[PDB]
Each structure stands twice: as structure tokens, then as C-alpha cells.
Amino acid sequence: PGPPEDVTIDEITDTTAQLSWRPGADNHSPITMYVVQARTPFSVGWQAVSTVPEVIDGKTFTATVVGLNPWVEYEFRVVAANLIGIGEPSRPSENRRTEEALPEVTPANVSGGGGSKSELVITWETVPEELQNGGGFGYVVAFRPFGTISWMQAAVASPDASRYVFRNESLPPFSPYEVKVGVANNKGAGSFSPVTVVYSAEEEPTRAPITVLARSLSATDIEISWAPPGRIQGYEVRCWRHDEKEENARKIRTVGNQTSAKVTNLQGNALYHLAVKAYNTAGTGPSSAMVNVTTKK
């Protein structure tokens, strides 16, 4: 058997396409069967497809291919079969894109967090092109503060996107948000991912430590304590000698709820200046008042 010719896509729908071929070299024994194979940007080589009629005899020359993927560029080719063997494939038809259809798949791994002041960061995994099922693909990000009713939809019109940031100066710091994302193309809208909870961005502490105490333990050691007045991971206390500039100040940081520290490796009979700030991940808050201590001799 030998290659058929003149493969054409007569009509095409969102899931089907009508094909038409003309028979070619059939060696000597008659043609008993025709099969259709398809190729896509996602296919490894040529792939078999379902057809109506379910089987294409040698006397049939048009069929509908069924079960195609919406909004995908398809190539087709037809292979003849003889009682002696399988023929050579025909040359591929011209590439045609299927019609549009609604999107069915929702983005994966919706999460987020972080960002600059007064922001809310939402992330997701981008939906691949084969599953976008239409042009004009985009994402719908719906969010609301935990315990509230009304939603807020933002449309992210880039199909390749995987991130959305909402900024507004009335945003509470490090606050919880219900978040879900969805998909939509030109035909309409898809469904939504499951609801997850994303926390807004965090700001540095707003108040400064109070009632700073400081006493010299030895010629090289100074003890310093304070009281706490939003989240606080610890405290940064800085310390610089009188003759040195504040820019270069020895800084050491508290981790935990402890409200004191010891500054060591100092010079004997020297005046030092110390103050302590609160800090979170966002940065250092305001500085407490300054205290002045001279080490022992």
C-alpha cells in the first residue's frame, strides 16, 4: 500500500473536525482501512484519534475526527492499510486551530504573602496553553478580609501571569485574607480554585521601647534592659563610644521575648551611648530614648 493524498480540513468545531482525502498508490491488493493521526504542539510525534465512522473502510473518504482539544493547532494525516501491510502515511494537512470553548481547569497552588508596605501578594501556578481553551485567556483574583462578606475581583489579563499585588493605604498590617483565583477566556468564565488564606504584608514596629535601663558590669561589659510598649520578633540595641560617630555603632539583636541584653568587649573607663529599637521582618521600629553609661575602671 502507498500514501494517500489531498488531506484537507473541510470544517472544524471546538471538539471535532471534518476531513477529506483522496486515495493514492495501493500497490496491488485493495485498500481495506484508513486511519487518522493528529499532531499538536503538545504531542510527541503523531497520535491516533477517534473518528466517526468509528472505523473507516476503504470505500469511505470523509470522516469526522472527535474528541479534539479546544483552541489548539492540529495537524492531521491519513494512513492506508492493505491486506499485505500498513501503507505509508500521507503528507500532513495544513495546520488549523480548533474553535473556542470555556476553560475548565483552575490554577494550582494558590498561595502568597510578603511584599512592601500596604500590599497583599497573591500567587498561583500558570495554566498551560493547551488547557486555556480559548484566546483572551486571563485570571480572576477574588479576595476579602477574613470574616467579611463582599469580595473584590481583580482581572489579570495576562495568561502567562502567576502573581497579583493589591496596594491600598487602608490595609491593615499582616492581616488574613480569603483568596481564590479563577480563569476566563473569550467564551466566558471558568470556575474558581479552592479558597485559601493569604496574609498581607508586614510593617516595621510603630512604637519604641520604653524605660530603658543601663548599668556597667565591668570595664568591658554593660547591661541594658527595657519594656515592651503588631508583631515584634525582638530588639536591636546599638552602642557607640562618645568619640566615635553613631553611624558605626556596635549592634546586637534580641531574639525572643527577653527584654534585656549585655554589651561586651568594651573599653575601660569609657562613656558609651546606647538605645534599643524593636524589629520585625520588615525592619527596625523607632529608637527608644538614649542612655549613657561609663564603664568601671
Numbering used by the authors: 598 to 826, 833 to 900
The authors write:
Contactins (CNTNs) are neural cell adhesion molecules that encode axon-target specificity during the patterning of the vertebrate visual and olfactory systems. Because CNTNs are tethered to the plasma membrane by a glycosylphosphatidylinositol anchor, they lack an intracellular region to communicate across the membrane. Instead, they form coreceptor complexes with distinct transmembrane proteins to transmit signals inside the cell. Finally, structural analyses of five CNTN–amyloid pairs indicate that these proteins interact through a conserved interface involving the second fibronectin type III repeat of CNTNs and the copper-binding domain of amyloid proteins.
We designed three variants of chicken CNTN4 by changing interface residues to alanine to validate our structural results. Residues T751/V752 or Y781/E786 were substituted with alanine in the first two mutants, whereas all four residues were mutated to alanine in the third. Introducing alanine residues at positions 751 and 752 in CNTN4 resulted in a fourfold-reduced affinity for APP. Residues Y781 and E786 interact with H137 in APP, and changing these two residues to alanine led to a 20-fold weaker binding (KD = 115 μM versus 5.4 μM). Finally, introducing alanine residues at positions T751, V752, Y781, and E786 results in a protein that does not bind to immobilized APP. Importantly, this difference in binding affinity is not because of any gross structural change brought about by the introduction of alanine residues as evidenced by comparing the structure of chicken CNTN4 with a mutant that includes all four alanine mutations. Consistent with these crystallographic results, mutations of residues T751, V752, Y781, and E786 to alanine in chicken CNTN4 that prevented binding to CNTN4 also abolished its binding to APLP2. Overall, these binding analyses indicate that the interface identified between the FN2 of CNTN4 and the copper-binding region of APP represents likely the arrangement of these two receptors on the surface of cells.
